[PDB]
């Protein structure tokens, strides 16, 4: 049986650990409301004192679910157990359900507001698994599923950038900007098939990941340091004459053996630019066809490449990934700054011998025989990113540690059905409704146990590294205080990074 | 299962292209409200300064769906692909669903208005596929399905003209107008069987087109110009003596060869008449039986025949089809005027030799061996028209490019069920309700690819012919602006006419 | 008669309407933070990155804009000269004698000058500027690219973009007058094979 | 709608300059395209969603 | 039958478009003449004012067919249709005939 | 005709630097180091790095 008085699902939660795989189960209560007055609009974002930066976006009457982050699928207990007991993991299968939908009418009679049920109202649900439309999600967005299961999950309006604004606008009648503008695409999600659900209906979605592993492995030595210091080498070295010092040809010392392996790539040369309101990055990636007007700075035609560092040790704080732990974080209050994992593949430098000292070269490009580790990711990192479609690319290693995929999990779009109301002159006036429901996400994670011949104990993540916080400062991290506020980790180690624990023999 | 909390369908959308056929899918949200106070009325339309023109119509308490136009079934992307890649197309099968119905009560307590659900209320739905009643639709009406999928679709009241008003009215007691009046038919749609649906119910309709193809083909030369200029002809010509010029009998020149093919028909002779409020057309088609009073002008007893031109090139703007792109268009703002497709079958003239020069003859009637192309239709044209039942007719080629059919797609009529309320004296008072729902239309279009032995490239429809518009004039045609307004094409070429692209060898 | 079976990579005609770095929602806030160093009198700041500027993980494709063509037209004139000169040889001429010009150097970087653009003559009788066709931007957002290096005040174009991780670009747009394929030479090692003239190397 | 290659982007050439690109003139000479767009480049037309 | 008065082939031409594949057919009349006096020679190319550039080449008494270009396999009509209607293409199979020799 | 532009290019290599210091050190033009932030590192780069 099914109907108004029958529920379409139940609450799933918790994790399940085995040797081969882990299953995380999460359910949230979500809220969907009418976005953008049920219409598509193309508006300009022109900031003041932004360094000439401007965007043009199409705002849709649609909102979407975003599952991309680890904190949303793992409790701090489960993340600890994951990074302590397993040497690598990747996502395998993802299953999403949307069910127990309640569509309600909003009645504003005055300062008061009352809520009734529209039992025949419905909600639009569309999953784009083919990535036929512009992608809704970007890594490190505020729009992710909540961390704690009992918070309401408010979806965000969907929108996309149809064009570079600086190249589309036509100033003193530019012919090539005229051609850029005429080609600006426009996407409506009503152009495809999707489900419409009433309150007794539910939907489900499955996705199969095909991924590369995420390794948490500590290198105790660099790749250049692996050799026996007591065995002599037959290699010889020639030192050129320097000033009064005579030239020499000699056998290389046993404790210094030349390595065939080299620092990974990274760009340390540049610095951030301009006021905070601009796009401020040491490296700016622009697209500027020939003939365009482009009256602004390069931030207008370009996107900042951050972090530039790669596996090179950041020289300054400008080169480090840092985020805010809550949406209310501002300035230096609530920000978490990446720190070295103390893996010997993650902090690297090249020095260029000038015949007297060594000098750091800031730009290490891609070179043969380079070896490095991928960025150590905490529980607050996004899981995946969208790899853009292109003819050619180099090795794909996003510097934020996300897994780049040709086909990430499809974005699920959700919308309130427009209920129009009559008017003497036909005008756009609709019934004011919203939907709340329950959404569950089960991801199956493939994992691998570790084995080691190391004699000594290894570093693990412990609760004794956590801090104390809250209203009276009597409660620890990952707990709630007097007022129900959740105490956030204040440092990067409290977020339990990967590649800090389990050693590997190179 | 089915009931209040179960949806009866889902949203369909998008197009699907193959070699043999194209499938367009469209869904709209529609609104039906009480029309005409639930009663049939026969009212006179007597305009002022109309040139004596007057109509009498029967207004029904019914509204109807109108699917007749190309813009409603094709996106500008799909229309472009259709007219670029295919040499002919016709509609094949049409399928309509009406589902997800919501009937709501309108409660007016004052300036405020609230909306509740009547779950036991119902809606009347009738499709006339036999054309037993008067036809609801006329080409080029405002009442068509909306172009963009996310706009609400407001149905229009149904009504018909029972009689010529000038011939029905009886003035100084006319005996033949007395007889016209007594024979005036009266049609109620309650005279037949139809479905009544509540909110959990839905309906479907199918229609099979039997049609003639719509050809998009460019003639690069006229039919009279096809011959070899270098081959001599054995035909001879006699030129009569003109003034001092002697008579001659001579062989026709190889570069001028007489043709057996002739200009298609059209009427250029007349001009439009009277003030704009009248029926203003160069040619007036009247029915005026003998004995009638007929005190007005001919516009009262007659209907204007527009456009008169046929395949003849319009001499003036009066002879060209022009429309307004939005219902808010007025004067020269927002009007699109037909232009020559530059096909060599579409702009034609006869010249009558007077023995000295040639002079255009304006009236070209139907004549043997006439050859012409049908009117080039854009995406804003109506698809079909109703061919009236009659004993005899000539070749059916509507000058607006519509496909005339004995049985077009049947009109679907929809009405709110009257819910009467009690009163002390039985009086006509009803419950104020309206219905909103979802209607989908899937048309299957039969298409044909082209093949050519032409060496050179051919004209195609490109986005670089489109214009820029909107609030800030930064956005192109067929896009939305800052305020959500859809930028309309401002010229006839921006509407992508057929017969401008793919050449044919006569 | 002769038969040959191609084993090839596709030739894509695809326009990118936006760059890979521009794909994100401008109205959704980001949790990323940015630190701006103290510059002169301007104080140091640590702040949340603006929603309309979101840092990208994708970067300009490679190309070499640094050099210029050399010498009279009769020489091998290219900004970049690829030479093979074993040790001990006499080599009394310039480097064009022992080397082959690498043209076009540009890659997916927008050509700064006409020297960096592919141009040909449409007939064998073409000479000077009569009959030559010069490549133009396709107006795809993967084909005209630049890196700018922030000096803490403005941005400055860096001419040499070498191969780097997470680079993404489109292959050269080819017209009907392009050669279809080229011969890929036999060698132990090579990098990603993407001839800058758009030919399919086999 | 998306950009397409059309013959209306072609030029006029030849002996008397009455004939278009990709055609032959009075003397049998084949009129060549004079610009890069007249050669119909790839990647100018069909959009893709990254 | 075959001999002096029997032709060994016919003229093929034109294109054929489907959804999965396109077939281009082209026939040319070619001329081969004696090259290099029927001998191999190794000559120096020493240009004047060439920036010291010089080549040494071996000239054979042989000539060759070169099919590498798009203009040779596609008419402007066919190229237009290719680049308007298709999002990607690659060559699959190539077949060459040499016949009707005089 | 005798100068035709090539689509192929020189392989990679680093010629910029020079060897450093006395023969007893690790003497190489290029030094590959791993030096996490916060460390004391009172010696030259040869101490934290491999040539």
Residue B243 Rama label (left phi>0; alpha psi -120 to 50; beta): left
CA angle (A67, A72, A76) in 5-degree steps? 160
Find chains touching chain A: ≥3 CB pairs under 8 Å.
B, C, D, F
Q: Do A258 and F50 touch (CB under 8 A)?
A: yes
Residue A77 CB coordination number (10 Å): 11
Distance CA(E77)–CA(B456), nearest Å, equals 5
Identify the helix (H) or strand (E) that includes residue F48: helix F45-48
- DSSP tag of F12: P
Of F23, F27, F30, the CB nearest to A352: F30
**Contact between chains at D4 and B462 (C-beta distance less than 8 A):** yes
What are the C-alpha distances in Å from A369 to residues A265, B134, C157, F10, F12? 11, 83, 29, 17, 11
CA B100 to each of CA A120, B104, B417: distance values in angstroms, whole numbers, following the listed order: 8, 13, 17
How far is CA A424 from each of CA A274, A338, A429, B34, B35, rounded to the nearest angstrom?
54, 61, 11, 12, 12
Sequential DSSP letters for B267-310: E-S----S-TTS---SEEEE---TT----S-HHHHEEEE----T
Distances (CA, A) of E73 to B454, E28, E69: 15, 11, 7
Q: Rounded to whole angstroms, how far apart are CA atoms D31 and D20?
A: 7
Query: In angstroms, rounded to a whole number, what is the distance separating the alpha carbons of residues A311 and A326?
Result: 27
Measured between CA atoms, how close is C172 to chain D, in angstroms?
9
A472 touches A482 (CB < 8 A): yes
3-state secondary structure of B252: coil
C-alpha dihedral sign at E38, E42, E47, E51: positive
- The rounded distance, in Å, linking the Cα atoms of B98 and B205 is 9
- CA A479, CA A482: separation in Å to the nearest integer? 10
Alpha carbons C151 and A375: distance in angstroms, whole number: 26
- The C-alpha atoms of residue C138 and residue B323 are separated, in whole angstroms, by 37
CB contact under 8 A, B19 and E19: yes
| Chain B residue with Cα closest to A433 | B115
How does DSSP assign A100-152, residue by residue? EEEEEEEEESSS-EEEEE-SS--EEEEEESS--S-----TTBTTSPPSSTTSE
Cβ(A58)–Cβ(A372) below 8 Å: no
The count of C-alpha atoms lying within 13 angstroms of the C-alpha of B176, restricted to the half-sphere facing its C-beta, is 10
C-alpha radius of gyration, chain B, whole number: 27
Strand intervals (E) in A142-291: 152-154, 156-163, 195-197, 203-208, 214-215, 218-219, 236-239, 248-251, 266-267, 283-286
Determination technique for this entry: cryo-EM
User: Of A40, A169, A431, which has the smallest distance from its Cβ to B484's Cβ?
Assistant: A40
Number of H helices, E strands in chain E: 1, 6
A124 bridge partner residues = A196, A415
Residues 6+ apart with CB under 8 A from B212: B90, B403
Q: What CA–CA distance (Å, rounded) separates F26 from B114? A: 86
Tokens of A40: 């598509």
Token couple for C29: 């806030």
d(CA B18, CA E19): 9
Say whether F3 and C199 touch across the interface (CB within 8 A): no
Q: Would you call C175 and D39 a contact, using CB atoms and an 8 Å cutoff?
A: yes
DSSP string for residues in B146-187: PSSTTSEEE-EEEEEEEE-HHHHS-SS--HHHHHHHHT----
Are D45 and E83 within 8 A, CB to CB? yes
Q: Closest-CA residue in chain D for E87?
A: D46
Which residues does residue B44 pair with via DSSP β-bridges, in sequence order?
A: B56
Closest CA to A22 of A80, A65, A96, A98: A80
The answer to whether the beta carbons of residues A286 and C145 sit under 8 Å apart is yes
- Which is nearest to A45 in space by CA: A144, A178, A164? A164
Name the pairing type of β-strands A152-154 and C63-64. unpaired
Question: Which among B453, B455, B460 is the nearest to E76, CB-wise?
Answer: B455
Paired residues of D20 in beta bridges: D12
Distance CA C74, CA C92 (A): 18
Q: Enter the DSSP assignment of B316.
A: S
Residues in Cβ contact with B69 at an 8 Å cutoff, skipping those fewer than 6 apart: B144, B145, B380, B381, B382, B383
Measured CA distances, E90 to B38, C7, C180 (Å): 66, 9, 10
What does the CA dihedral A254, A258, A261, A262 come to, rounded to 10 degrees? 120
Say how far apart CA A41 and CA B484 lie, in whole Å.
4
Nearest Cα to Cα of residue A390 among C54, D49, C163:
D49
Q: How far apart are CA B159 and CA F44, in angstroms?
A: 96
Nearest one of C111, C175, C113 to C144, comparing CA atoms: C111
The minimum CA-CA distance between D49 and chain C, rounded to whole Å, is 7
**Residue B244, both tokens:** 């001092």
Three-state DSSP state, A226? coil
Resolution in A: 2.7
Contact B102, B199 (CB under 8 A): yes
Gap between the Cα atoms of D34 and B295, Å rounded: 69
Beta bridge partners of A16: A23
How many CB atoms sit inside 10 A of residue C31's CB? 24
Alpha carbon distance A47, A50 (integer Å): 6
The token duo for B117 is 């659900």
Q: Is F16 exposed, middle or buried (0-12, 13-18, 19+ CB in 10 A)?
A: exposed
Q: What is the 3-state secondary structure (H, E, C) of F15-37?
A: CCCECCCCCCCCCCCEEEECCCC
| Secondary element (H or E) of residue B443 | strand B433-449
Distance (Å, rounded) from C-alpha A91 to C-alpha D27? 70
CB pairs < 8 Å spanning C and E:
101
Q: How far apart are CA B118 and CA B4, in angstroms?
A: 11
**Integer Cα distance of A326 and A329 in angstroms:** 5
Q: CA-nearest residue of chain D to C19?
A: D50
Which positions in chain E touch D42 (Cβ < 8 Å)?
A: 83
- Residue D44 with chain E: CB contacts under 8 Å: 83
b/e burial code for range A207-228 (CB count within 10 A of at least 16 → b)? bebebeebbbbbbeebbbbeee
What DSSP designation does A238 have?
A: E
Q: What is the least distance, in Å, from the CA of A262 to any CA of chain F? A: 6
Edge-to-edge, what's the strand order for the sheet holding A335-337? A335-337, A322-324, C32-36, C45-48
* Cα–Cα distance, A459 to A473 (Å, whole number): 28
Q: How far is CA B404 from the centre of its chain?
A: 10
Helix, strand, or coil (residue A180): helix
Question: Largest Cα–Cα distance of chain E, in whole Å?
Answer: 61
Q: What is the rounded CA–CA span in Å between residue B439 and residue B204?
A: 10
Residues 6+ apart with CB under 8 A from A410: A127, A128, A129, A130, A131, A205, A207
Euclidean distance between CA atoms A385 and A377, whole angstroms:
14
β-strands C32-36, A322-324 pairing? antiparallel
Chain C residues within an 8 Å CB radius of D50: 16, 18, 20, 23
Measured distance CA(A278)–CA(F5) in Å, rounded: 43
Distance CA A306, CA A303 (A): 9
Q: Within a 10 A sphere around the Cβ of B307, how many other Cβ atoms?
A: 21
Residue A76 parent element (H or E): helix A76-85
Return the SS3 of B469.
strand
Token pair listed for A329? 């974080």
Q: Output the CA–CA distances (angstroms, integers) from residue C123 to A55, C5, C175, E65, E71, in the order listed.
A: 45, 31, 16, 19, 13
Q: Which residues, 6 or more positions from A212, have their beta carbon under 8 angstroms from its beta carbon?
A: A90, A403
Residue D11 distance to chain E (closest CA, Å): 14
From first CA to last CA, the distance across chain E in angstroms is 18
The SS3 call for residue B16 is strand
């Amino acid at each position: 049986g099914s109907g108004v008085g029958i529920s379409t699902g139940g609450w799933v939660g918790g994790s399940y650990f085995t040797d081969s795989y882990v299953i995380t189960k999460n359910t949230r209560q979500f809220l969907v409301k009418i976005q953008n007055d049920h219409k598509y609009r193309t508006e300009n974002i022109i900031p003041s004192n932004a360094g000439g930066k401007s965007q043009r976006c199409v705002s849709t009457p649609w909102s979407y679910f975003n599952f991309n982050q680890y904190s949303s699928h793992f409790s701090p207990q489960d993340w600890q157990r994951l990074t302590n007991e397993y040497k690598r993991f990747k996502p395998r299968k993802m299953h999403v359900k949307i069910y127990n939908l309640q569509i309600k009418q909003i009645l504003s009679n005055g300062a008061d507001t009352t809520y009734n049920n529209d039992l025949t109202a419905g909600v639009h649900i569309f999953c784009d698994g083919e990535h036929a439309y512009p992608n809704a999600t970007h890594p490190w967005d505020e729009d992710v599923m909540p961390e704690l299961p009992y918070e309401t999950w408010y979806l965000f309006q969907y929108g996309y950038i149809p064009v570079i604004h600086e190249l589309a606008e036509m100033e003193d009648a530019n012919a090539v900007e005229k051609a850029i503008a005429l080609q600006i695409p426009f996407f409506m999600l009503e152009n495809s098939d999707h489900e419409v659900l009433r309150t007794g209906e539910s939907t489900e979605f499955t996705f199969d990941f095909d991924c590369e592993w995420i390794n948490n492995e500590r290198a105790y030595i660099p790749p250049g340091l692996m050799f026996n210091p007591k065995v002599p080498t037959r290699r010889a070295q020639y030192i050129r004459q320097h000033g009064n010092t005579a030239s020499s040809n000699t056998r290389i010392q046993p404790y210094a053996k030349p390595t065939s392996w080299m620092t990974g790539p990274g760009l340390l040369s540049a610095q951030r630019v301009g006021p905070a309101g601009s796009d401020t990055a040491s490296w700016m990636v622009v697209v500027n066809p020939d003939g365009t007007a482009v009256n602004s700075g390069m931030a207008g035609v370009g996107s900042g490449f951050d972090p530039p560092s790669g596996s090179l040790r950041p020289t300054d704080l400008e080169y480090k990934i840092q985020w805010y732990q809550t949406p209310e974080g501002t300035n230096s209050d609530g920000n978490i700054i990446s720190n070295p994992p103390l893996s010997m593949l993650r902090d690297q430098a090249l020095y260029r011998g000038n015949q007297t000292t060594y000098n750091l070269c800031s730009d290490v490009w891609m070179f043969p025989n380079q070896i490095w580790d991928r960025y150590p990711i905490t529980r607050e990192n996004p899981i995946w990113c969208k790899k853009p479609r292109s003819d050619k690319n180099t090795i794909i290693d996003p510097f934020d540690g996300t897994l780049a995929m040709d086909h990430p999990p499809g974005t699920i779009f959700i919308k309130m059905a427009k209920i129009p109301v009559p008017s003497n002159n036909n005008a756009d006036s609709y019934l004011n409704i919203y939907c709340t429901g329950q959404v569950s996400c089960e991801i199956v994670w493939e994992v691998e146990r570790y084995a080691t011949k190391n004699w000594r104990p290894e570093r693990r993540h412990t609760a004794l590294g956590l801090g104390i916080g809250g209203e009276e400062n009597i409660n620890p991290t990952y707990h709630v205080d007097k007022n129900g506020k959740y105490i956030q980790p204040t440092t990067w180690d409290m977020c339990y990074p990967i590649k800090t624990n389990i050693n590997k023999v190179l």
